[PDB]
Every structure is written in structure tokens, then in C-alpha cells.
Design a protein that fits this description.
This protein has one domain: Immunoglobulins (Immunoglobulin-like). It contains 2 helices and 9 strands; from the N terminus they run E-E-H-E-E-E-E-H-E-E-E. The strands form 3 sheets. It has a 4-stranded antiparallel beta sheet. The chain has a 3-stranded antiparallel beta sheet with strand order 1-3-6. Strands 2-9 form a two-stranded parallel sheet. It is elongated and about 45 Å long. It binds calcium ion (CA) (5 copies). The site of one calcium ion (CA) has 3 residues, from strand 7.
């Protein structure tokens, strides 16, 4: 099983978490493609010690709802996609993100 490419979009438009964003939920999104990545593979994000999870869609994208306060307290995290091949062998593909907090 072969690793793909996981990327993480900007954390909101400007890649900054402001006080008003910190108050609620923030959709964190990105892409997962290439290698053996496929639809329904899990994407796992640890943000401020909290584990946030979603799955890959048919177009190689993902989106998860994160508490904005977790984002205000953690300025960097990896998104990790777990894939397998036809024989069952698994692989992890990691993408990284930073953002800033105002
Ligand atoms: Ca960023
Ligand atoms: Ca923002
Ligand atoms: Ca972190
Ligand atoms: Ca400031
Ligand atoms: Ca400011």
C-alpha cells in the first residue's frame, strides 16, 4: 500500500482564527489523493489533544467540524489518512497545517 498526498486548506479564509471564530465551530478541510487513498478512508486530526475524524469523499476531499477554541489553542496539527490496498495492507499518509490565532 502506497501513501498519497494529504493537504489541508487554509484555516478559514485568511488562515487566522479570530476571537469570533474561536467562539464556535470551524470547518477544517483539505484533499486526500494519490497512492492507495480512496473514498471512505478515514482522516484523523489531533487539535489541542482532541481527536477529530472524518472520511474521504469521492472527489478526494474531506471536511471536519472542529471547535474554534481548539484551533485557538493549537496552531499546528497533522491530518493523517489511513488507507489499505486490495490485499488489506495499510498505509498512513500525513499532511501538515499551521495557522495563526489573532
Ligand atoms: Ca495554513
Ligand atoms: Ca479567519
Ligand atoms: Ca498541535
Ligand atoms: Ca492580535
Ligand atoms: Ca487584529
Amino acid at each position: 500500500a502506497t501513501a498519497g498526498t494529504v493537504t489541508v486548506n487554509a484555516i478559514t479564509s485568511d488562515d487566522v482564527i479570530n476571537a469570533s471564530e474561536a467562539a464556535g465551530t470551524v470547518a477544517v478541510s483539505g484533499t486526500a489523493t494519490g497512492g492507495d487513498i480512496a473514498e471512505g478512508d478515514t482522516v484523523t486530526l489531533e487539535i489541542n489533544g482532541e481527536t477529530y475524524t472524518t472520511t474521504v469523499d469521492a472527489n478526494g476531499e474531506w471536511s471536519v467540524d472542529v471547535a474554534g477554541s481548539d484551533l485557538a489553542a493549537d496552531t499546528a496539527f497533522d491530518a493523517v489518512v489511513t488507507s489499505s490496498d486490495a490485499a488489506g495492507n495499510t498505509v498512513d499518509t500525513t499532511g501538515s497545517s499551521t495557522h495563526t490565532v489573532d
